[PDB]
Ligand binder design. Structure first.
Ligand SMILES: [Cl-]
Length: 98
């Protein structure tokens, strides 16, 4: 199975923000990660999640990864922009959402 990566997009399967997209910002191991989206869940409220409660998406933000590699942190706004790029790719899949 694919191993979760820093900067990788997830869809939340179970949790407060079920069905919403988020970003992995820390990997404990392949079972537990921390997520934040910079909006509904800010970095200082990052949530520890069991991977059973997440769907890994095939999208990884190099900008988020760089921020962590160099400095060990990321801003909320950089997470929002990472998610926005994902949303832009899939706009036509999502445009009938209400
Ligand atoms: Cl959640």
């Amino acid at each position: 199975g694919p191993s979760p990566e820093i900067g990788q997009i997830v869809k939340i399967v179970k949790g407060r923000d079920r069905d919403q997209f988020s970003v992995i910002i820390k990997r404990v191991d392949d079972r537990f990660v921390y997520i934040a989206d910079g909006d509904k869940r800010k970095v200082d409220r990052a949530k520890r999640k069991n991977m059973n409660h997440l769907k890994l998406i095939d999208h990884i933000s190099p900008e988020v990864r760089h921020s962590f590699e160099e400095t060990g942190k990321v801003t909320n706004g950089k997470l929002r922009f990472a998610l926005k790029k994902f949303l832009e790719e899939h706009a036509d899949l999502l445009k009938e959402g209400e």
